[PDB]
Write a protein that binds this DNA or RNA. Structure first.
Lengths: 293, 289, 285, 285, 283, 288
RNA sequence: UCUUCGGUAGUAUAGUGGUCAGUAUCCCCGCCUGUCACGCGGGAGACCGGGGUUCGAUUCCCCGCCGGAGAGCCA
């Protein structure tokens, strides 16, 4: 009767060894699929700078309003602008093209905008020096807004330019420089990576205002004089590449890991069951050898 | 002729010793290198960024710190493209949810500093702004400046009675920006949600001031009338989220190592079978019958 | 045709399994080759925050013109600058170490460095107050440049300050401070990693100008008094490291091991053809 | 035959001799290992330090108040000075006084200063003192020259520096006159554990001081004291151990193997001799 | 049980590789020790003896002084005092040429060079003497430097360069006024890798007071006196020795290889002896 | 078969001669490097240092040579960095041990130079220091100074005999210092012993004097009167040992030689194995 | 396609339900009888593979691999 119980105990051990590795496999595959779904939930960041040598012509959509473009001189490399007496017009050696459109988010108002061509040569540090004057009024807070878009010649050679300002304000953000300062804007360009098209352009900038010596002007009525430059901070275009360990990585790693752990989950069980039936037969051998020595 | 026997004696010994030596020399090499790589990847968790959109922000924690400065207005201009022109100096129109707390200084435990916490803007979509106005006619420092800090939520401060520790932890964590003394500082703000190992999102603020000079010469400021201005608003509806994820999975480490061990076992067995076959083909070639 | 055609139908499965395994292997190696084409973008960013307590004092290369310093009062303990007076030179207690050399860009211009030690502690908010002065001239906009580099001691200990400062000027950028504002320049470090781990660093800074009342010295010509409050802001430094996510060892291991499941599938094919042969033998016998 | 008894002894004799020389050589090599372990050798190293290494110069005037300091960043001829004028405390006169650690009864003072820098340009501290002449003869002012001024500043519990650095030096003084000029240099010895110790050694060179300027009427004192740096080639000392980590045991095993091989070869050769002797015996039988 | 015997044979097979691992570990340890020994070269000194020292180099920059006596007391120590200030007894091989500064490049240096003493057995000493007019510098001094041999200045050319090179190698010792600075000099030779012998001078001054009461120097004029005896009749010979020789560790590696071969062979013989368990069945 | 026999024999012979040769080349090459290494390490012995420690030094001799002066004051001020100073220039209070010997010179062999031998301080831990105030009449001593010489055994000087030679040899060996005529020469003598070969080690005194000036305001200005103080101490409670070790060991070197000879013998055995492989190849050649 | 016969050291076989899987040759070592074996004395190498019964199966049974033997269309 002892052997009749032993043949049941060893069957129980057989089933235990089978189901141990039949449950480990399912637990591991479920854990791996859950982990790879988690990885699919959110990708990681992969930046690259790809420094350039000759920037494109950028777009600067000023909204001067009632002011006047006194000067838009392009200091081709002159990091120290030639001092000139404020308060009078002159030297419109600029690439301005006054083009207006209706502003969205309002649906009721017209607003003009003298989009100008920005500097290109970062190595030479090309500049653009502006000067806006306005007869003082009740506004008491003189800020002249300005937008920024990547390509200017694209605006030059695009039919139905409605997009170029009816979408810039709806996409970009509206900065503004002060009245009575010289807002030094050191722009830079940053590119993202979307799955729909190819990429996108977003601007960054570091305004560094410096005071304006009101002498030699004497604003008796209070004539404010806006002054703006638009440098190019760096020859580098930090592009954001949103790399994913999500679509191909999940599938490939899933299939490989599972089909290669099934290998052990089968081989170890086979070896263990073979050797345990071997030891069962060995116990039978030793008891029957005690019987028939 | 024992030439075949001697060639066998050379081959099985040297070839098999070489193959079970190269097996170890590759297995231990790869296991050590990949364990080191696992430790390295555990050393440097990779960051994850995205932009979860928010239609309507909560009530932020703008907390002005005016030392003996008189508030003049709180107009929460809901959507105004530019706030309407205001005559300075005159008080009134202070429709801001305001509370004053002052217990102790977190730094040096020096003294009390009263705050003027405002509920702050909510609707980013309609570009809510909370345009302030200040006044410091009686100047003795002669070195103008006004301090302000931001915290996460208003009702979180309001409901919790930990008033002193609110301005303890907020002051210790958030830096102390100071909007300029005299001209309006259009302080757009944005939120950054960084995650932690425990799932806690300890948020911090990010702002991009844009100082606009004032032409407030309608005040006769000869006596020392230095009046300030502030504008808060929410920069973009989006919110940045920061989460550092573990790039190394030990449950993939173990799978990779057991798989390469199985590869090496199969390679050794195949090599043994192949050498046995190449040895035994001459056995059927030396004798024909 | 009763048995020869069946044997041909069995043997075409041999070529079938060969071509299937070839195609699957080619597809898998194509996927892995695309992965190591993405290897170009595999440089990813991993950042950490070293909670540093005591900080290295950094050199602060100011580049004044016709200006003259007035104070360097380092408020090691004080986080607040006590009230002071315009003009009136006093307590030039900094470590001004003028090394005025020629331009590194055009090699013609004259620059006048005034390296200051800067602060050390950040838990105590160690300010480094400064002050300048300039009698008015035809200077329609007034600005006093400056610049930064990694460490003061790396300037003091290293020899040949000529190239040490000349290359640093062109390498970094120059963000100035204005004529009449307390340009409260905070500062912080980003610790990036190069291809080998040389660990170059550059400076992040958040200026915040603030107006200064000038009635106390009645400048009747345009006298300008600058003020700079260089101060370390971050109680911890950011550590940018560009780790790469893929190594060829994983590629070769996974490929050569899915090769084994391919071989096992071939084994099942070789068993199944024999099983079908046995079944057909039983059926047609 | 009798030749068998003749040769049946030197067989075991040669193995006995080999065992004897084996134990002799193992004793010789173990004694050599003991000797080479009991006499570690040193290695001298020169490093070309280019810069500061701020030392914690100390002085113990007690009654001789300071009257001058200087820092001649490049001046091998320090110019004239007024004898007896107090002030110009350009030194970082971090004055601290502490009780004796050794006698535990004397209220000792200190006038720690900041040490010379710029060894390349030979920057040299300079001093000047004064003391109303008292009953004590042989006017002497003790002074230590411990190192690490920069860490001395930030160090906590400054009593320990004074109470400890006295024991680890000999406190060489400077005289009551004639500008005891004091050069100095460093030695960097390596301890047994792995740490290192830095000690200052100095080469005074006194030069007589002309008193044709003070014209004292009592016998007052104006003893200077001058510091500098000697050649920057700081001596690094390392006490390396004789290279016997495992070579002794490996060559012990080698001599073991060769002696066993030689014993076996001796057996082979003597067996060959026995074979040829048996052949000769059969020839001559 | 034959399967057990083959499994023990497989155990010996596994043991066969732990010897390889230990050998490779010892090889790595040996290569690390070799690199360490090539990283810290050892030093040695041998005090050789010299019967007749070379006539050394003595550079002096008196400035506005004037050598009043240059007597070679061959072995006598009796001090003659004719007059503290008179010029006389210039009995030495002296030679002065002024050269511009090789360091500042502006000033000129007046190298009033004196040959010096040779016979250490007789303890030759070159008793100098110098007087200076009163000046405002408030403490007198004379920088003086030494070089290898006066003959290296006598016959050699480029005498301007031959002194200009020896500018900052030494530390510019100096004797004072109203003193008798006794300078016992010794010479140390270092032996570096490139076969050159850089000679250096090391000396131990011992100032002794002087009596000017016999000259009535109330005005403020100071005197100077120097001697330059050679201290020891020896020369320090410091040699840096490399203590690592690859041709002394290749034999170490070979011995390791032989002992591991013997160990493996003994393991094989041990399992062959273990076959006695089957040999008993054969019996 | 003649051609095959000739070619095989020449091929085997050239292989064996090539390896046999190499064997000899590496043997002579290694014995050459052995010769070079052993001769080089015999030429340049390598020296070592160590620092033992004591708390109570023995009594060292101090051979003063006062030509005309006198022991105005001798003391044993231990532990007192402020020695009790009396009125200068007044004799008495000599609480030391002396022996006014007067022996011969090695250079003149005729002068009976005095030597007021004293024993130095011993308590380094309590920094004991002697104090030897003197005075002379300097009628003509324009550069006043009295020599002093250090030997390391006062106790062994006492009980020993032939004291003329016991002072003669120490005078010859150690160089003669001198203390200033009008200063205070603080002499912090350290003790250095070198463990030489021949079963003998010798001691050497090295010291760094530090003159500190003396003020004579307490004595009336006189002609032919300059006094001077000399101080002896103990620098460190250490004793530096300079011992020379030897790098080369004949036992180790012959061990290397035996190992490489074993390796080359095994290489020749593998050459013999190649010979037997050639023999079997020739057996196959004749079988075919 | 079907039906038998056999498969063992490197060679030839002999063994078989309970074990010096043996022997001759071949492989190694001691003797040199004129010789590197012409002759002796000691030591060494194996059940075609897989599964199943049996205390144990190289033996008993089944399935695959290898030959050789026959009918032979398997076209």
């Amino acid at each position: 009767f002892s052997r009749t119980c032993l043949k049941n105990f060893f069957s129980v051990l057989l089933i235990l060894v089978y189901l141990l590795l039949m449950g480990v496999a399912v637990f591991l595959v479920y854990q791996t699929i859950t982990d790879f779904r988690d990885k699919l939930k959110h990708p990681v960041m992969s930046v690259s700078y790809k420094e350039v040598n000759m920037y494109d012509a950028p777009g600067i959509a000023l909204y001067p309003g009632k002011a006047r473009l006194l000067s838009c001189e392009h200091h081709w490399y002159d990091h120290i602008p030639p001092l000139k007496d404020p308060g009078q017009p002159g030297e419109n050696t600029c690439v301005t093209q006054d083009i207006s459109y209706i502003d969205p988010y309002t649906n009721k108002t017209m607003k003009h905008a003298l989009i100008v061509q920005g500097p290109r040569d970062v190595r030479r540090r090309e500049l653009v020096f502006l000067q806006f004057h306005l007869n003082e009024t009740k506004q008491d807070f003189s800020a002249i807004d300005y937008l920024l878009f990547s390509s200017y010649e694209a605006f030059l050679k695009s039919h139905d330019q409605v997009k170029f300002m009816q979408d810039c304000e709806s996409s970009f953000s509206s900065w503004k420089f002060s009245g009575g300062f010289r807002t030094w804007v050191k722009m830079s360009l940053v590119k993202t990576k979307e799955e729909d098209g190819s990429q996108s352009v977003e601007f960054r900038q570091e305004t560094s205002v410096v005071n304006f010596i009101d002498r030699r002007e004497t604003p008796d009525k209070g004539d404010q004089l806006f002054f703006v430059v638009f440098e190019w901070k760096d020859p580098y275009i930090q592009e954001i590449q949103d790399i994913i360990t999500a679509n191909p990585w999940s599938m490939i790693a899933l299939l490989c890991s599972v089909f290669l752990v099934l290998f052990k989950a089968a081989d170890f069980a086979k070896l263990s069951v073979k050797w345990m039936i071997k030891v069962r037969r060995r116990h039978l051998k030793k008891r029957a050898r005690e019987l028939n020595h």
